[PDB]
C-alpha cells in the first residue's frame, strides 16, 4: 500500500542521521561496536556504513552505491549517501497530496541531464599554467592540514608529502602503497619518510643479538616456511627401550637443516624474512655473516618486500635460483621513535613505501593518519583526471542556482520538482557549517548575495567563518566526484521511493 512508501523513507533517515556528522574533516565520528568486539573509529564513511548491515532492504542500496563510490572514485562516500537521502525527505510531503511517485522520480532525472552539461562548463583543465611541479603539491598539501593540530608542524610535513608521490608512478597511483604505523612516544615533528618497510618490535626478551646495524649492500631473500629448532610453545616427548637413546630421538631435524645453515653463507643473502615465527636457530649463524633477519612478519609486509627488489618467494633454501635475490642501496636501523625499527632505503624498483608517524599517544596519530589520506586522494585523482573543479561547497552552490532558473522555463509539474531538487542541494553546505560550528542560517543567506553576481567560483572558507573564494583557499576536488555522485544518488533515490511493498521471508 501507500503506507509502505512513507515507512521506507523514515527508515533511511535513521541511517542518514548518523552519517550527517561524519561529513567533513572536522565532523563527528560514529562509534561502531562489531560482534567481534573490535572497536574501530574513523571518519571515512565507506568502512562505517559497511559495518551497519541493516536488515532493511532499501538500506542495502546505500551500501551498494558506497562500494562503487569508494572503488571508482574513493572520495565523497559520506556526501553521496546524504544527497541520495535528502531527496527522499523533501519528497515526503509531496506524496501526501496525491502526487504519484513516478512523476517525482522522473523529474529528478530531468535535472541530471542539465547537471552533466553544467559540470563540463565548470571543469577547467590547467596543469603547467601559473603553477609548477613542486608548487602544485606544496600549496595543495597545506589545505588538508589546515584547522588541525599539525598546522604548526605542517612545514616539515609538506616536504615529506611531495616526495611520497614522486617515488611512485604518476600514471598509476594507489593510496594503499604508502603505509602508516603508529609509534607511541616522541615528538610529532621528528618523523621521516622511508621507502622501505618497518616492523613492530615484538620481542621484549633480552640477552642476545649483539650486532651493528650499519650495512653496505644487504641481499634480500624470502622464505615461505619456518626453519627453527628452539620452540617456546610445543615440546617433544621421548619414550624408548634404551636409556642412552633418549637424546637422539629429537634430533631428526638436524642433518637437512645443518646443511641449510651454510647454504645461506654460499648464497650471501643478508635479509631473511618469513611469515611464521622463527626461533633462535636462524639468528645464530647470521651473526658473523652480518645477516639481518626479523621473525613474526605479517603477511601484508612480505608482499611489499617482493615488489621492492623484484624478488620472489621460495619454499626451501635448496632450489632458490639467483634471480630471486635482491639488493637495496642502504640499510640503516635508527632509534627514531625511541625504539630500533628496521627499514629499507634506496630501492629504485620499489613499488611501495611507508610513512612513519610519531606522537605522544596512538589516538593522536590516528587523527593524523586519516588526515594524510585526504591529501593523497586529491593528488591521486589530480593526475589521471585532468578536469579539476572548485569544491568545498563552491560547485554545490552553483548547481542549485542555475536549476532554479531552468524550472521557470519548464511548464508542468516538473517546475516544483526541479525547484525542490535544487533546494535539497543546500544540505551539503549546511551540514559542513554545523559540523565545524559555524552558523548555517546566516552564511547560506549571505552567500546567495554575491553568488548571483555572475562569479561561479565562490566557496565556503573552512578556517574563519565568512564568505570567500576556494581558489585562494586552494580547496580543489576532481570532476569525477560530481559526475559519479549525481548519477548514483539519483538512481538510489528513485529505487527506494518506488517500493510499494517490503517482503521478508522467515525460516
Amino acid at each position: 500500500g501507500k503506507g509502505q512508501i512513507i515507512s521506507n523513507i523514515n527508515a533511511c533517515v535513521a541511517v542518514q542521521e548518523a552519517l550527517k556528522p561524519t561529513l567533513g574533516p572536522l565532523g563527528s565520528d560514529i562509534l561502531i561496536v562489531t560482534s567481534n568486539q573490535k572497536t574501530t573509529i574513523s571518519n571515512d564513511g565507506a568502512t562505517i556504513l559497511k559495518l551497519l548491515d541493516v536488515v532493511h532492504p532499501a538500506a542495502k542500496t546505500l551500501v551498494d552505491i558506497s562500494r562503487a563510490q569508494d572503488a571508482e572514485v574513493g572520495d565523497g562516500t559520506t556526501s553521496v549517501t546524504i544527497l541520495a537521502g535528502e531527496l527522499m525527505k523533501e519528497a515526503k510531503p509531496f506524496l501526501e497530496e496525491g502526487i504519484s511517485s513516478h512523476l517525482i522520480m522522473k523529474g529528478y532525472r530531468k535535472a541530471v541531464s542539465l547537471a552533466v552539461e553544467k559540470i563540463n562548463e565548470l571543469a577547467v583543465d590547467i596543469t603547467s599554467e601559473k603553477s609548477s611541479g613542486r608548487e602544485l603539491l606544496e600549496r595543495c598539501a597545506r589545505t588538508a592540514m589546515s584547522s588541525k593540530l599539525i598546522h604548526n608542524n605542517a612545514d616539515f610535513f609538506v616536504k615529506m608529502c611531495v616526495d611520497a608521490v614522486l617515488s611512485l608512478d604518476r600514471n598509476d597511483l594507489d593510496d594503499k602503497l604508502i603505509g602508516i604505523k603508529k609509534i607511541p612516544g616522541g615528538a610529532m615533528e621528528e618523523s621521516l619518510f622511508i621507502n622501505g618497510v618497518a616492523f613492530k618490535k615484538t620481542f621484549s626478551y633480552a640477552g642476545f643479538e649483539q650486532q651493528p646495524k650499519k650495512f653496505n649492500n644487504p641481499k634480500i631473500l624470502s622464505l615461505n616456511v619456518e626453519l627453527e629448532l628452539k620452540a617456546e610453545k610445543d615440546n617433544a616427548e621421548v619414550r624408548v627401550e634404551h636409556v642412552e637413546d633418549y637424546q637422539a630421538i629429537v634430533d631428526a631435524e638436524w642433518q637437512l637443516i645443518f646443511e641449510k645453515l651454510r647454504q645461506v653463507e654460499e648464497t650471501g643473502a643478508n635479509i631473511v624474512l618469513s611469515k611464521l615465527p622463527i626461533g633462535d636457530l636462524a639468528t645464530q649463524f647470521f651473526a658473523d655473516r652480518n645477516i639481518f633477519c626479523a621473525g613474526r612478519v605479517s603477511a601484508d609486509d612480505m608482499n611489499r618486500v617482493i615488489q621492492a627488489v623484484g624478488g620472489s618467494i621460495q619454499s626451501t633454501t635448496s632450489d632458490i635460483k639467483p634471480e630471486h635475490l635482491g639488493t637495496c642501496a642502504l640499510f640503516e636501523e635508527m632509534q627514531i621513535g625511541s625504539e630500533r625499527y628496521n627499514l629499507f632505503q634506496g630501492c629504485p624498483q620499489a613499488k611501495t613505501c611507508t610513512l612513519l608517524l610519531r606522537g605522544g599517544a596512538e589516538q593522536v596519530i590516528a587523527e593524523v593518519e586519516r588526515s594524510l589520506h585526504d591529501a593523497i586522494m586529491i593528488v591521486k585523482r589530480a593526475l589521471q583526471n585532468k578536469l579539476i573543479v572548485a569544491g568545498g561547497g563552491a560547485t554545490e552552490m552553483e548547481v542549485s542556482k542555475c536549476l532554479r532558473d531552468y524550472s521557470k522555463t519548464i511548464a508542468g509539474k516538473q517546475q516544483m520538482i526541479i525547484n525542490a531538487f535544487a533546494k535539497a542541494l543546500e544540505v551539503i553546505p549546511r551540514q559542513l557549517c554545523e559540523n565545524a560550528g559555524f552558523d548555517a542560517i546566516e552564511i547560506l543567506n549571505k552567500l546567495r548575495l554575491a553568488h548571483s553576481k555572475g562569479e561561479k567560483w565562490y566557496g565556503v572558507v573552512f578556517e574563519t567563518e565568512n564568505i570567500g573564494d576556494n581558489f585562494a583557499k586552494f580547496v580543489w576536488e576532481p570532476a569525477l566526484v560530481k559526475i559519479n555522485a549525481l548519477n548514483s544518488a539519483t538512481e538510489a533515490t528513485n529505487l527506494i521511493l518506488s517500493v510499494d511493498e517490503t517482503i521478508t521471508n522467515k525460516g
Binding site: 562503487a68 512523476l103 511548464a411 517500493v499 510499494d500
Partner: protein, 524 residues
C-alpha cells in the same frame, strides 16, 4: 459470503501486480531462509520465490506459470486480467445473478473474441531475421521493465539471435531456435555502451595454465574428456601407496611417462584444446604447457550439452583414445580482457555455425545487473513465438488492444438475446483496467487521459469505411503532450501468439474461482 472474501484475498495481491506491468514496475527483494537474495522483475519468477497460502491464489499462480513455459511472455497480462474478471463478477453475484450463467457467458464471449483477432492484424512479420526487423519485436518486451535501456539492449539481443539462426525461409518442419540458445552472463565493471555480442558461450573463469590462447589456425580441434587425468589403473579401488622407498622411483617416473605418452598422441592428431570435466593433476598441467594445449575445465554437465551442438565434440568415457570422428571443430578461439579481467571466450568466424550464443553484460550497478539478466530471458521466448502458430501476425499494443475490443464486444451484446447480455457487457468493461493502470501509475489524471481513449476509437465518420487513426493507444507521456499519440511512431506491437494464448488462460483462471462455492482444508 466466502466467495466474496476470496476475491478480497486476491485483491490484496492484485494491487501488487498493478504496480508491476508498465514502466513503473520494480523488482522485489526476497530474502530466502538460506541467506540468499534473489532479485527479479518478472512476475512468474517472483511467484516461485513467494510462499502462497490460500489455494485460491494458487489457481492464478498455476495459470501464470503456463504463460511462462509456453509463450514465455505476457505473464502480467494473465494475472491482471484474471483478477479484474472477479471484480466485475462480484457485482453480478451481489445483484442475484447465479454464477452458472456467468461462466456460460464467458464461454460465448471468448469465442467471439478469438474470431476477431484475425481481423485486427496490422502488420505481418516476414521472418527475415534482420537486425533492423528484430528491433520491432524486442522493443516492447524490454519496455515496461527497465527504462532507458531499451535503446542499448535492442541491438545486443537482436544481434545474438541472428548468429544462432541458419539461412532458411518458408520451412516450418524442422525447428531451429530453442530456449537455451541464448545465455546471459554478468561481470563487475563496465557500462552498457561497451557491451558486445559473442557468437558462442563465454567462460569467465581462469585457464589455469601458462597458455593464454591458441593460434589463428583454422578449424581448431576440441576434445571433451570426462575421465580425469591420471595413470590408468583398476577401476575398483586402485589407490597408489608406497610401502618402501625403492618403489617410489618406479611409481613416480611411471606416472610421468604414461601421461606424457598419451598427450603426445593427442597433440599429433591436431587437437589444441582438451576439455576435462573432472579435476586435473599437478603433473598434467606441465606437459600441456609445452605442447601449446589450452587448459579448460567444465565441471558443470549442463554446459557440455550446448557445446556438442556447436563444434560437434562428444564426451569420451575413457582417456587416451582421440577418435577423429567425434572431435569438434571451431574456427577461432581467443583470450581477451572484457570487464577488467582477462578471460577465455568462445566464438566462431564462418564455418561451424554456432547454435548457442552468449551476451556479455557490463555495468557499475549490482541491482540493475541481475535485472537485465532476467529481462533478456523474457525476450528469448519472443523469438520462439515466430514459428508457424501465428508467428507473423501482430496486434497493436500499449493498451490499444484492450480498448478496441470494448466496441466490438458491446456490439455483439445486444445481438444475442437472453440473460447472456449481463456477462457479455461486464466482459468488455473488465478490459478497462489495463488503460487505467498505465495512467494511474504514471501520474496521469483519470479525468483527462481516460476520456480521450474512448474518443480515439469511437468517432463519427460519414461513411462505412473506417478512417483517421485507429492505432492510438495509452501514452505514458514523460515530457508533454495533448491527449494521446499514435503508437505506430514508436512501432510498439504485440504478437498474436502471445495475446491469443493469454486470453484462453485468463478465461479459465477466473472460471475456476467463480465455480468453487466451498473450500475445505485441514492443518498440516
Amino acid at each position: 459470503g466466502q466467495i466474496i472474501k476470496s476475491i478480497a484475498a486476491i485483491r490484496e495481491l492484485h494491487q501488487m501486480c498493478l504496480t508491476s506491468m508498465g514502466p513503473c514496475g520494480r523488482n522485489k527483494i526476497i530474502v530466502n531462509h538460506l541467506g540468499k537474495i534473489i532479485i527479479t522483475n518478472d512476475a512468474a519468477t517472483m511467484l516461485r520465490e513467494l510462499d502462497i497460502v490460500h489455494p485460491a491464489v494458487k489457481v492464478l499462480v498455476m495459470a501464470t506459470e503456463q504463460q511462462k513455459i509456453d509463450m514465455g511472455d505476457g505473464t502480467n497480462l494473465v494475472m491482471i486480467l484474471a483478477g479484474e474478471l472477479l471484480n466485475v463478477s462480484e457485482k453480478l453475484i451481489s445483484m442475484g445473478l447465479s454464477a452458472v450463467e456467468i461462466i456460460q457467458g464467458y464461454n460465448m464471449a471468448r469465442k467471439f473474441t478469438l474470431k476477431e483477432l484475425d481481423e485486427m492484424v496490422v502488420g505481418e512479420i516476414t521472418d527475415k531475421n534482420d537486425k533492423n526487423e528484430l528491433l520491432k519485436m524486442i522493443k516492447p518486451v524490454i519496455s515496461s521493465k527497465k527504462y532507458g535501456s531499451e535503446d542499448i539492449l535492442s541491438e545486443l539481443v537482436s544481434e545474438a539471435v541472428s548468429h544462432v539462426l541458419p539461412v532458411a525461409q518458408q520451412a516450418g518442419e524442422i525447428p531451429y531456435f530453442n530456449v537455451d540458445s541464448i545465455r546471459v552472463v554478468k561481470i563487475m565493471g563496465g557500462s552498457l555502451s561497451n557491451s558486445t555480442v559473442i557468437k558462442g558461450m563465454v567462460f569467465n573463469r581462469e585457464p589455469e595454465g601458462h597458455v593464454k590462447s591458441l593460434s589463428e589456425d583454422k578449424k581448431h580441434k576440441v576434445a571433451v574428456f570426462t575421465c580425469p587425468l591420471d595413470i590408468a589403473n583398476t577401476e575398483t579401488k586402485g589407490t597408489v601407496l608406497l610401502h618402501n622407498a625403492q618403489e617410489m622411483l618406479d611409481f613416480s617416473k611411471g606416472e610421468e611417462k604414461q601421461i606424457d605418452a598419451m598427450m603426445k598422441e593427442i597433440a599429433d592428431m591436431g587437437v589444441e584444446c582438451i576439455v576435462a570435466g573432472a579435476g586435473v593433476g599437478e603433473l598434467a598441467l606441465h606437459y600441456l604447457n609445452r605442447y601449446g594445449i589450452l587448459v579448460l575445465k567444465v565441471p558443470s554437465k549442463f554446459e557440455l550439452r550446448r557445446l556438442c551442438r556447436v563444434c560437434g565434440a562428444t564426451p569420451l568415457p575413457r582417456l587416451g583414445a582421440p577418435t577423429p570422428e567425434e572431435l569438434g571443430l571451431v574456427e577461432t578461439v581467443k583470450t581477451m580482457e572484457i570487464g577488467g579481467d582477462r578471460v577465455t571466450v568462445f566464438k566462431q568466424e564462418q564455418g561451424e555455425i554456432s547454435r548457442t550464443s552468449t551476451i556479455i553484460l557490463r555495468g557499475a550497478t549490482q541491482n540493475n545487473l541481475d535485472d537485465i539478466e532476467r529481462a533478456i530471458d523474457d525476450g528469448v521466448a519472443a523469438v520462439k513465438g515466430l514459428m508457424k502458430p501465428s508467428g507473423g501476425k501482430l496486434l497493436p499494443g500499449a493498451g490499444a488492444t484492450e480498448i478496441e475490443l470494448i466496441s466490438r464486444i458491446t456490439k455483439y451484446g445486444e445481438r444475442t438475446p437472453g440473460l447472456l447480455q449481463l456477462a457479455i457487457k461486464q466482459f468488455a468493461v473488465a478490459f478497462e483496467v489495463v488503460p487505467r493502470t498505465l495512467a494511474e501509475t504514471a501520474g496521469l489524471d483519470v479525468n483527462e487521459v481516460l476520456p480521450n481513449l474512448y474518443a480515439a476509437h469511437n468517432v463519427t465518420e460519414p461513411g462505412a469505411v473506417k478512417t483517421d487513426h485507429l492505432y492510438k493507444g495509452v501514452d505514458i507521456d514523460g515530457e508533454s503532450d495533448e491527449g494521446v499519440k499514435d503508437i505506430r511512431e514508436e512501432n510498439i506491437y504485440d504478437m498474436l501468439a502471445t495475446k491469443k494464448f493469454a486470453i484462453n488462460v485468463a478465461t479459465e483462471a477466473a472460471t475456476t474461482v467463480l465455480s468453487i462455492d466451498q473450500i475445505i482444508m485441514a492443518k498440516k
